[PDB]
Design a protein around this nucleic acid. Structure first.
Lengths: 45, 50, 72, 150
RNA sequence: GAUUCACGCAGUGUUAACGUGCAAAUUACUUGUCAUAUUUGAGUAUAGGGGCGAAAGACUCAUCGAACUAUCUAGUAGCUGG
RNA sequence: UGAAACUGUCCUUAGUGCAGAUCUUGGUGGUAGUAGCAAAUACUAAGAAGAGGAAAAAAACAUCUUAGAACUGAAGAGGAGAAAGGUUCCUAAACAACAUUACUUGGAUUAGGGUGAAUCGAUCCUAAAUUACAGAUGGAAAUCCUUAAGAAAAGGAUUGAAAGGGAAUAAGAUUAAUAGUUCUUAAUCAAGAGAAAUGGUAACAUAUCAUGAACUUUAAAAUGGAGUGUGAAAAUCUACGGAAGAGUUCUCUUUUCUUCUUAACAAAAGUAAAUUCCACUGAAAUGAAUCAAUCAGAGAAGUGGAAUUUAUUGGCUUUGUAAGAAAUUCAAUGAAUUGUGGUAUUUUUGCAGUCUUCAUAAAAAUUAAAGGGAAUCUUUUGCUCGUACUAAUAACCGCAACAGGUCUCCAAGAAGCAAAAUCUUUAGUUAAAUAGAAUAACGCAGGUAAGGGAAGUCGGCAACAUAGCUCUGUAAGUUAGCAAGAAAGAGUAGCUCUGGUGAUUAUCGAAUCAGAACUUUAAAGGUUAGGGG
RNA sequence: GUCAUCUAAUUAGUGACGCGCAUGAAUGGAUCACCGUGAUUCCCACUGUCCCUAUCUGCAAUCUAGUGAAACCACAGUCAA
RNA sequence: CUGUUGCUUAUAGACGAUGGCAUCAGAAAUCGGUGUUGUAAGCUUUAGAGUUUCUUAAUCAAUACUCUCGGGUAUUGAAUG
C-alpha cells in the first residue's frame, strides 16, 4: 500500500546505452528479491 | 424539457439557427465592418429567457 | 435563508410567450399579458409609460400595407 | 492517440462496464482504426479486446463461522447486541406453540382418542397457556383418558 | 397527538471555523427532532391602508412599522458641500 | 514632430476661464509579484501521441493503454425520469481566448451528423378553480351572474392534471448518437367491409351463438389510515447431482470463484391458499375455530358441490412463443450442456378478518347488466405534436465548473435488533479553485499527559466520564396512569461438549435459550453506544 | 431585610417571619405529579478548566517554479518637553 | 583571495546567516558494540478439556512444551570498523 514500504530493499541498477543516441546512457533499476538481508554487500554484477 | 409544444420547439430551433458567425465571404466585401456577430450567446453564458 | 438558499426551487414559469405582442409577459394564472394587455381588444398603453409607447407603436415594424397607402 | 471511443464501444458490445474492458497495450494502432461497433466486434473475435474476469469474492470465511454458530461457538452473552424479544420474538413463539398444540388436538379428535366434549375442554386449556410444549399436552390427555376409563 | 434509533429535517451550544468567506447566513462537531397539529410535488385561490399571520409587526421575489415600477418631479429645504 | 486649414485689429454675441462639490465619465498608480491558487483520503511504473522533462535533481510532467494501489459502498460519487436548460448529445480538425499552474483534455473554437410510435405520453374527461353571448350594475374603465334572470345553452356554455380517470406490445438484435418508436419474429385494440337456445335440485355453467327499440334502475371507473396473520413471485442464503471455464498449489485444500436464463399474448397434463354461497341433516352434555378474534334454530359442525381473488389467459409447476434467441466454454463459420428441492431472511404484490375517527377519507368521460316488450373466419385503414442530452461536488436556480438549494424509480455480501457506524462485490472514478523542498514562531482540525481534581470561570463553557445485552434490585412523590432504563450490583472471550423447544410417519429441519469442563493477554467497547442524584 | 441551613468562608440557593415602596383572586389566587436543546443552586463521578505547561499528527504559515487580486492612500512616517 | 556550488552537510536553521569537510573527500551496505519488545515460521515436537471414525489406529482441538536469552527493530538527530 501507500502507507508502508519494506524496511530494506535490494536493487540492481544497470547503466545501458540509449537506443536512439549512442552518446548518452540511461539507468535501469530492477528488483532483486532476497530471503534475508544478512551478510549482503554491494556487488558489481 | 423533453416535452414541448410544436410552436415552442420551432422557436427553439430558430435560436439555434441564429447562433452562427459571419461567413468568411461576407467578411471580404468592400467597406465591411461586420466581422463578429454581437448577438451571439452560449448556453452556459446567457439564458435566452424563453 | 432568504438569499442564496431560497433560490433553489425557482423552476416554475410564471410568464410564457404572448401571442399578440410576442414577449414573455403572458401570466399563466392571471390569464392576461402584462405588456400588450391580451384578451383586451385595445393594446395596453399608458401615458406614464412614455418609453413603452416608443418601444412598440406605429412605425416600429414592417408597415407592410400602410407604407404603400401613405405614399399613395 | 485516445482510445476513449473504443473503450466505451467495447463495453457496450461486451455488456460489461468500462472497468472490465481490456484493450491490448501492444496493438494500439490496430485498435485505433476501429471506429465502429462492427470493427470492435471483429477485434473481440481476434482477442485484441478481452472482458476481464470479475473480482473473486469468497464466502469460505462466512460459511465456517456459520458452522461454529450452529455448534454454539459464538453465541455467548458478550456477542448478543439485541434484546431478548428482538432476537427471539415472544409473539411468534406463541404463534408456533398454538399451531403445534392445536394440530395435536385436532389429530386426536379425528383419530378417535378424544370426543368433542374433551377436545373442547382441552382446547380452552391450551389457549389459556396451561401446557408448555407438545409433550406436556400428550401427558395430560393420557391422564384425563385414564381417569375417564376408571 | 406514548419512549427511542435510522433515511431525512431544524438550528440549542461551541457565543468553534469563515468573516475582502465554499456561502450577500454557509461548514464541523454537539444538541434536538424524525407520521397524523407529520413531511412534501404540481395545480389553484387571496394583492398594497390590501393580502396572509399557532402573533415575531412576522412574510408578501436578497426590498416591509406599508412591496416593486413609472408619472406628478429638476417635489420643498431658514440646513450641509462646491 | 505634424500634413490642411488658419491668424491679427474693431464692434456684436455667449453653453466663455476650475484644484476641490463622497463632483460625472474614462484611464492609471503605490499597496504588489504581496494576500492567496490548503474541505471532498491518492497517487506510482512502463509505453504511445505531441514543439511541449528538460537537468550540474530544474525532486513537480496534462491526455490515452496496461499493471500496482485506492475511494463512492449499493437511501451510492451507480443505472434512469418530472421541472428547468436548449444542442450542452456523437464524431472529426484545431488550442488565440476560458476552466485562480499547464493541458495534446473539455459541458471551450470551427464543420458536419443526430430525436422514426395505431399500442409510450399530449390530444379525450372532469377536481380545486377559470372564462364567454344575452341579463343585472356602473359617470367611466369595467364589475357581477355560470344556469339563475334568456323564444339561448334530452338538459345545460369555455378552459383547468405529460403525478387523478384512460381501448390496445413484447423478447432479441441494431447506430459514432434513436429506440416499449428502427429490423427479425411473435401479438393486441378500435372503426368499418365480405314468435326468437339448452344443462344443473341449487349456488350456477355453456370456441359468437341462442333477436331485443323507447324509457327506468343498478354496478363498475371510484376511494382513509394503523397493526397482526398468510398465499405467490423475485433477490440473497442453503441441500442433493453435476457440465464448462478460472484462481491457489511445495505447505495443505475431493478445493475457492463464474454460467447453467426466458417476454408479450394464449393453452389447460398436474395441483394450491383464503373468502362467500348451495344441497342433505338438525346442535345442549353446547359446539366450531383464530396469533387475535368471531359465529350458530333468520341455522353451527360434518359430507358433497358452485363461485371469485392470487402482478396475462386460470394462482403455481408445465406447455405453445422457444431455442432457431441469449449465457458459459471449444475449434477454425461450426460444435457441446442449460435437473430437482428448502417447516430460512428481505422486498414486492394480493387476501382475510381486527382497531380508530365530533376525520368517514373526489367527479366525469366511458362500459356492462337488468326490468320492458317496440320491430320482424378473410381483409382495409389508424392522421397531428413530443422523443437527442444533463437531471447535478460541472448541463437546473443562486453573477461561476459556487461545500447552498431542487420532486421521484430500481437497490448485493459481512456484522448487527437495526436501510445505523465500518469493510467489500456489479457499476463509477483516481480528477474534481497548482505543485516541490524545508519540518521555525503564531494558528485551524484531531490527540495524550505525572500528583491534585473546578482551587479556573459570570457560569463545569470546552473536554473528560456513563454507554450494548442478560439476571438481581429499585425510593420519595403521584392526577394511581407514572416516576423507572430510577438509583445500585453481578455476568459477558476462545475451545470441546450436553440438554430444551418440531415435521413427516426411522428420515428431515429452524435459529434461539439454558448448562458444564479446559485455556488465556480475564473478554460489549474496533465501530455504534444513557452521566446520575 | 431578620432567624435557621448549606460552606472553613455565602450580595448566591433553600426553609421560615411579614404594617407588603408598589402581592392577591378567569389582568385569574394557591397548588406540581409526568413533561422541557427553558431560568437557578447543591452533591457523586470524571477530567489540561486550573496549579503550569510539555509534547504528537495532518493542513497551512516559511522558501521556490507558474499564476496573481483587494481594502486603503492630502504629503508622509524616530523621540522628550 | 572571496562568493556560488557539493556532502538531499552539522553542534545551526523560517529564508539569508552561522559551523565543518571537500580526493588522505564523501556516501552506502555489511559487521561488532549498544538499546526496545517478549520467545518468530516449520515439524511427524509432549501437556491438552473433550469428540469422531475405524475397531481401538487415525482424525479434529482454545491453549501449552523442545528447539528459542528466540525472531524482529535499532539513527532516522546513536557509537566502531
Amino acid at each position: 500500500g501507500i502507507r508502508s514500504v519494506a524496511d530494506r530493499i535490494r536493487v540492481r541498477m544497470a547503466r545501458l546505452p540509449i537506443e536512439g543516441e549512442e552518446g548518452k546512457f540511461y539507468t535501469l533499476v530492477s528488483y532483486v528479491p532476497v530471503a534475508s538481508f544478512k551478510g549482503l554487500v554491494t556487488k558489481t554484477v | 424539457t423533453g416535452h414541448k409544444g410544436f410552436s415552442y420547439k420551432l422557436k427553439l430551433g430558430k435560436k439555434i439557427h441564429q447562433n452562427r458567425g459571419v461567413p468568411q465571404w461576407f467578411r471580404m466585401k468592400t467597406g465591411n465592418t461586420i466581422n463578429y456577430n454581437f448577438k451571439r450567446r452560449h448556453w452556459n453564458r446567457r439564458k435566452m429567457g424563453m | 435563508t432568504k438569499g442564496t438558499s431560497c433560490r433553489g426551487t425557482r423552476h416554475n414559469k410564471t410568464h410564457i410567450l404572448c401571442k399578440r405582442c410576442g414577449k414573455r409577459s403572458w401570466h399563466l394564472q392571471k390569464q392576461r399579458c402584462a405588456s400588450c394587455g391580451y384578451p383586451d381588444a385595445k393594446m395596453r398603453q399608458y401615458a406614464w409609460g412614455y418609453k413603452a409607447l416608443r418601444r412598440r407603436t406605429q412605425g416600429t415594424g414592417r408597415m407592410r400595407h400602410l407604407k404603400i397607402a401613405l405614399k399613395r | 492517440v485516445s482510445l476513449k471511443l473504443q473503450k466505451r464501444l467495447a463495453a457496450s458490445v461486451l455488456k460489461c462496464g468500462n472497468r472490465k474492458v481490456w484493450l491490448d497495450p501492444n496493438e494500439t494502432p490496430e485498435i485505433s482504426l476501429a471506429n465502429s461497433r462492427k470493427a470492435i466486434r471483429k477485434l473481440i473475435k481476434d482477442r485484441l479486446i478481452i472482458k476481464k474476469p470479475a473480482a473473486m469474492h469468497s464466502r469460505a470465511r462466512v460459511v465456517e463461522r456459520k458452522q461454529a454458530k450452529i455448534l454454539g461457538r459464538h453465541t455467548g452473552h458478550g456477542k448478543r447486541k439485541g434484546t431478548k424479544n428482538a432476537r427471539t420474538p415472544q409473539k411468534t413463539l406463541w404463534i408456533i406453540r398454538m399451531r403445534v398444540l392445536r394440530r395435536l388436538l385436532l389429530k386426536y379428535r379425528t383419530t378417535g382418542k378424544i370426543d368433542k366434549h374433551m377436545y373442547h375442554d382441552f382446547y380452552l386449556k391450551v389457549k389459556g397457556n396451561q401446557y408448555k410444549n407438545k409433550k406436556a399436552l400428550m401427558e395430560s390427555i393420557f391422564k384425563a383418558l385414564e381417569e375417564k376409563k376408571l
